[PDB]
Amino acid sequence: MKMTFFPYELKLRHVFTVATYSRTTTPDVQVEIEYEGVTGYGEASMPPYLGETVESVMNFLKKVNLEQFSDPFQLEDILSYVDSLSPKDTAAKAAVDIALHDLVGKLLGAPWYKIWGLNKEKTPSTTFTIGIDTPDVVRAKTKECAGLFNILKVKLGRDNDKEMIETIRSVTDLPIAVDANQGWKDRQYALDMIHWLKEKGIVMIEQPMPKEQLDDIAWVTQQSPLPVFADESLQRLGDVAALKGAFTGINIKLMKCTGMREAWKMVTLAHALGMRVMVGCMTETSCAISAASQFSPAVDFADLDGNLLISNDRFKGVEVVNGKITLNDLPGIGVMK
Template sequence: MDIAVRIETWPLVHPFRITGWTYEAIEVVAVTLRDGDYRGRGEAAGVDYLGDTPASVAATIASMQDAFRSGMDRQRLQSLLQPGGARNALDCALWDLDAARSGRPVWQEAGVRAPKPRLTTWTIGAEPPAVVGERAKEYAGARAIKLKLISDGQDAARVRAARAARPDIWLGVDGNQGFSRATLEQIMPALVEARVELIEQPLPLDRDADLDGFVSPIPLAADESAQGLASIATLSGAFSVVNIKLDKCGGLTEALEMVEAVRARGMQVMVGNMLGTSLAMAPAFIVGQLCDIVDLDGPLLLSRDRSPSVEYRDGMVWCSEDIWGGAWRPAHVHENG
């Protein structure tokens, strides 16, 4: 089994602003495993706020070449690599490869019912309020919109602008660790008035204890605070939703285990993304079949995508087996993008 790895740059349609970062393009790591006529592919962006960069992800993957040549499966990979981008790309590539070998698509191997289109959020970055309103109108096909908030004094106006532009949609917000408990309490009335239905990761991940005893009128979702399976048991009781991302937990294998663990705690499950192409969305789409909330709009932010690509229609996302995870994909098939 051979590994081919490369770092790719994908420009965005618009600069994308969140707490502490502005992106004009994204870098991802694309992996292809080859075993005779069979191949498997995976993609990862890494977890940048933890120092898990595309360069470090690619270096870790390259260091696994000898281990893969001597034989590798998903279970062994979990013990050799920690959660993060490198394990995600390799784990997803192994799932894809196993589907080709077995003649069974990934969703069957994972024990998931035949996939169906899922409602997905469409994300608007932390733009000036007037731009937020314009973006919300531009997303005419969206039935669910998520706003990035940055605690800069304009967040309430951003939320009002989005709701005024789109009174019909499900509306969520993502603080990306940019709030304190005091500033969260301060903005809460505006969020309630705008009928916001979800608040993602308002506080820094090392300040979860500040949420203890906080009763939010809007469900709170753990994102950065929920890195992987081990973190579920330690989450603040203020969270009622967990956002699973394959880059954080290290792939589809652990993501499926996280779904069970989150459900066992009586919490809702969300699947998200670290931005990426359709190749990154496809395995997360499998997880999305088991989730209450789906946030797989990464390719919508790109100026171009891979082919074949994810379909977005009437606010829904659909990933065909032709993108990833199908039962058979000969090694010589051409990759576009």
């Protein structure tokens, strides 16, 4: 089979903020794998702060030899080989993984949620983000979207956390999921900041402290009234077991774990250890978002709005209907170029 790839920068509709960073674009590489007339689509999204770039991803993909593989169904052997080409480049490896499942699914004539034996009717509601701004700009956007979602996401980990909730909580009573994003470097300042939110309608807390301080995080979890989910603290399958106890659940993202195959294994592992599972995303096109939505029926929370934040999506895949992630019946990852 043949693989091709090219840079495809994502244009964000509005300033996008993460911790102390902001951007209006996101480096991204689009991947394709052709085989006997069939094409599987893959994608790598690279928020600048995560360490990968157009260059690194393009370089990594140049190092992948797929022509040496005659059977696309050997995802175990093929993706194991891909992983071996470098110690990281998880986003770059995800693009190949995603493209391969798309291809395999197409060849099987089935969506991966089906191949995996899940009920698409059990997909969750996805959160949508309420950016940080002035009490006016805030209540405005909250107003504009509260009618389309069942749960909203707020990126706290800031200074006016208690502020945002109030502003937002004034013009809406929708449950809120907060992502400190490692903003609360303290310990007690984070624990109580949670009982508070819990009193103000928040229903889940994600990545409170920085990954480095696992002791603080762990500590804060058994004393937290709301489920804490690991994000920055977990990258791949081998990082899951070590988080039991420290977190209530894990947040899986294809760009971080290297794709669908490892992601699915993480869902199985997390659950086997009694942990909860949520699925997240970076700003991505409908390619990676749909790929991850394929296993969303098996999770508890989903932050799969990535494609809604960009203006140059090149695929029509999963739609948000009645606030829920909605899978179509297209085979593979479920998108149409």
